[model samples]
Target: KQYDFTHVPKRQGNSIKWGGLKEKELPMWIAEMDFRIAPEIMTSMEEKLKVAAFGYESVPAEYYKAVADWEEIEHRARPKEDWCVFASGVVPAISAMVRQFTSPGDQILVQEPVYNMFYSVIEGNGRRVISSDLIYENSKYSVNWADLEEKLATPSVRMMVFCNPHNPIGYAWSEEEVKRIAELCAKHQVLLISDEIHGDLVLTDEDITPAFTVDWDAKNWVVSLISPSKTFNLAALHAACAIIPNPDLRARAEESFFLAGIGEPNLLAIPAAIAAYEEGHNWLRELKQVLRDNFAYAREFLAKEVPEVKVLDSNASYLAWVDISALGMNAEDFCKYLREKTGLIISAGNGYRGNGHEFVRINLACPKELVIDGMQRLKQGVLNLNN
Candidate 1:
């Protein structure tokens, strides 16, 4: 069966990406995709409607089986069904876990130029953010081991948030890197939270090493949050799992989930997500190809027409993190200028921290036509700024 990536449905009611937009404006900011969800997931929801009982429901055994099976089949690793704890979303879980595991004055270790929301999750809970900012050079980003270890050793840094297949830059950590990070966190007794929301969207050859799959001795200290929200464009489903290998750790995490009020699943969450994991594999593969084409087009268009901008080599997510340093403008101003000049909305890097001020992120999860239009608008925006 053929999957369609060329067309987009009209924005549904209260659409965050499409809402509040001016005429001719395109939003390539949020991580959400422009593509409608896979038919497999849609069909499940339809099946759910046939039952007509939208009452309070208990999570079924099938949900955990589906998540474990998908992990085993797709990523070559299997998490035990008992390891899973349902959560409303990754951020909700993170905020709750941060509060549960760390003290108010403690520091949460993060890699800057990370998901901007991590900063909010850390600081909003009265914890400080201490970053081992990724070093950027030669159009590539890498970790500084010496610096990372030093910060992780800090006594007050009680927790660490790892962006597995990290956001903004989209550098998927190798298995060895994952091992080292886990070892260090265990050594320092720091709680590790792996946000694996983008695990299914890896466009590169490297398979994601689920935090639960690693062989580190400190597996007890780790929590892996996996979700179909980003993978299947089912953010509204509000479904995610905290995969904790340690029985004691899982129980504590559940306590936090209970307190945070994100432990319960909505009516459609289980069915929709189970459908995605069990049947949407082919659909995900198709989406990756569309994104690959879109990214290639954006890269080629920018190189030829907007030479000053360079898209970074990001492999996992649909977002394109580009270097705009040659334009001699900070990211916030550049982003605002693009919107004003061309009605093209993209995310500024400053909020992501680090040297993110020199970059901007573009969404390539849209149709090819929109990718082309976005590039054209970007080129036009650049030329006008140049003049």
Candidate 2:
């Protein structure tokens, strides 16, 4: 069946991305996509809703089977079924992990210019954020290994919130890089929290290495969080799996999840997630192509029409990080100006911290027409500002 990547459903009521927007405003800001969800997922949810029995649910064995199967089929990595623990979402899992695994005042290390919510989760839990900021050179980002090791060696640093196939500035780390980082974390006794929510959305054919797939010893220290929410546009499902290879760490995280009251699956979450993992692969394959086309079109448009803006290389996630430094305004000011002048709403990069001040993140997970409209508005907005 052909999946619809073109027609966007009306979001006047439920969308955080589209809510409270002016009629003419185009919101290409939030990570949420504008595409219709996979029919397979919707069908499963519909079937479940027809029963009209909303009750507390335990995760079925098929749920874990689906997750393990999806990973192996899609990414060449599989977690033992026993290694999996169900949770409400990746962020909630991370927050619970933070509270359960470390004490207050401990440092939670992260690579900066990452997903901004990582910062909030760390700070909200009374832990300090120590960034081993990725070095940006040649229009790409890479880990500063020396600096990362130095930070990991800090005695107070208890965990590292690793963004695999990272967000904002999307670059999927190489297998070698993943292993080396895992090695460092293990060496320093730092628990490695790998957020792979965007793993299946990687635009490139080369799959990202799951943290649990690292060398055996390094695997012992790695805990990965993944969800079909981002992959299948089922964020409202609020379902994610924590892939913990180490038995002891898995027990602690599961206990924390149970204690935090985030362990219960909402009635629809199980069926929706299972259907997504088991049957949404074909839809995902087509979605990635659509995203690739959108990215290419945006790249060509920016290169020709708005030569002042530089689109960074991104292999994963639907978000595009653009360098707006040439416009001589910080990202926040530029975003504000763009929204007011052209009704184009994109995310300001400074929220990602570090040199993100010089960047702006635009969501490209919309229809082609929306992508074109957003680009045109962005060009016009910059021209207006320049004039």
Candidate 3:
């Protein structure tokens, strides 16, 4: 039984990725995927549509069981169902946690070249964003452990927002790495919020460890946010769970989550999420293969046609964090040139803030045909840049 990754119908209307484009421009800037969602999810939503209740909904025990079982089977860790709290989205939950747990002007720790939304969430709520700034040396990204430990030990820094399998530059942190980070946070008594949204998208053989499962002495110090939105292309579904091990901290966070007004599930969030976690394993496996193939194609094509652009050998996620440094041009200018010359659109790395200025992030989750078109446009754009 093959799932259709090739023939997704055109988006109906107002696609954030598809809209506002000129006649021939292709948009590959966002995290949203172009593939059709798992049929299990759509069927679940359709059955709910038959009942049609347009009112507030509670997240049932089955939803938690599905999430817990998924984690146990997928990640080799079982986050107890009682530890889970529902939220509309990861960013919202993070914003609320930042506000509730830390005071104004307090610093929150992060690794640079991370998901751009972390910056926005920290600043929009009057908190200062601090980065240990992942070190990029010889075409790889690694944690500055000394710098990371120093900041976590600082009194002004109240929480650390971690990218478990780092976004933009894709590297799934190993179990020893995960425990070391958790241990440091526990030692410092700083709250650790691990954003595991990209946890399910790892393309490598290495496993992604959930933060909530780390066996640290301070069980109250860590909270892991897991969601199906990113995993199943359910962004509009507005469903996520915050897995907190300690009872008191979990209650406090839930109160803040409701204060932020995102705790209630939408009519379809429960059924859609449950379906995704319960029955989406096979579809997800097939998706990873497609993405892995897409990445291989992009890497080989770019290496041969445009040797100046080097794709980082990242083992996780569908995003291609390509280095444009060899071209002697900045990321912002190169992206603009691509849009103008080749009718192609992709993200400028300047916003992620590390050595991101010398790199660009390309979404590789679309069909292979679109990827081929994008690569051709990129080759033409780069070849013409010297002129």
Candidate 4:
């Protein structure tokens, strides 16, 4: 069956992506996709509806089996059934882990030009954020190992919020990279908190290495958070898995969720997530093709019509992180100017920190038509500013 990736249901009045927008404004900012959820997932939800009673429910054994099976099939690594724990969402779990594992005044490390929410999650919990800003050169982003190790050695740095298949600048870390990071964190006794939300969406054939899959003496120190939410466009489902290899660490992470009242799933979250893991593979293959086409169109369009912009090579996720420094405007101002002038809403990179001030992140998860529309609007916005 051919999946519908072309038609977007009218979402303007109800979606955060579309709400509060002017009649002509296009929002390509949030990580949420404009596509519909998979039919397989919907079938499960419909089955639940047939029962006709909404009440507190316990997670079934099937949920755990589905998670493990999916990981082994899709990611090439199988997390132990007992190693997997449910969470309301990745960020909630991260926040809970922060409070449970580290204390106030302790520092959390992250690679800058990363997900903006990481900063809020760390600082909001009273932990200082220490950044090892990824070095961007020749249109690529890479870790500064010397800088990263130095910061990890800092006594106050208790944890590192690592972005696997990193967001914004969508570079999927190789297995060697993942191993080195885990080793460094282990050497410093820093907990490696791997956020693998975008792991399934890697646009290339190269598989993203789950931190828990790494073979090292310190593999016990790794905790990875993954979700069907991002892959299945089920963010509202509020479901994720915490993959902890070490029994002691798993116990502690589960306890953190229990204490915070966030480990439990809603009546529908579990069913929806299970269906996604068990049967949504074909739908994802189709969706990824659409994403690849959209990304290619955006990259080619910008290269020909908007030469001043540089589209970075993205290996994962649907977001396009582009450098706009040639336009002589900071990210915030460029984003605002585009919104005001062309009714295009894209993410300002400054929120991601470090050299992000010179960048803008656009969501390429929409239909191909919208990708072209966004590119045209971007060109117009830049030309207007040029004048």
Question: Model 3, range 225-257, lDDT digits (tens) per residue?
Answer: 989988888888999999999898899999999
Q: What overall lDDT, based on C-alpha atoms, would model 1 receive against the true structure?
A: 0.91
State in Å the error of residue 192, model 3: 0.7
- Across 1-387, the per-residue lDDT of candidate 2 in tens digits comes to 398988988876767988877879999988889999998999998999998879778988999999999999999888899999999999999999999999999999999889999999999999999999989888888788899999999999999999998988887888998899999999999999999999998898777899999888888999999999888888889899999989999999999999998888998989999999999989999999999999999999999999899999888999999998898899999999899999999999999997999999999999999999999999999889757
Q: What TM-score should be assigned to candidate 1? A: 0.98
Pairs of residues at least 3 apart in sequence or in different chains that clash in candidate 3: none
Against the hidden reference, what TM-scores do the models get?
0.98, 0.99, 0.98, 0.98
Candidate 1 residue-wise lDDT, 1-387, digit = tens: 278787876876699999888999999999898888999999999999999878887778899999999999999899999999999899999999988889998999999889999999999999999999898889999999999999999999899999998998987788999888998999999988999998888997888887887675979889999999999888889999889999988999999998889999888999999999899899998898888888888888888989899999887899899999999999999999999999999999998999999999998898999999999998998899858
CA displacement after TM-score superposition, residue 182 of candidate 3 (Å) = 0.8
Clashes of 4: 0
Q: Count the backbone clashes (under 3 Å) in each candidate.
A: 0, 0, 0, 0
What lDDT does the true structure give each of the candidates? 0.91, 0.92, 0.91, 0.91
Which residue pairs show collisions in model 4?
A: none
- 10 residues in a row with least lDDT, candidate 3: 1-10
The candidate, 1 or 2, that scores higher on lDDT is: 2
Instruction: Return the lDDT, model 4, position 134.
Output: 93
**Residue 16 error, candidate 2, Å:** 0.6
**Among all candidates shown, the one with the greatest lDDT:** 2
Colliding residue pairs in candidate 1: none
Question: Where does candidate 4 have its weakest 10-residue lDDT segment?
Answer: 6-15
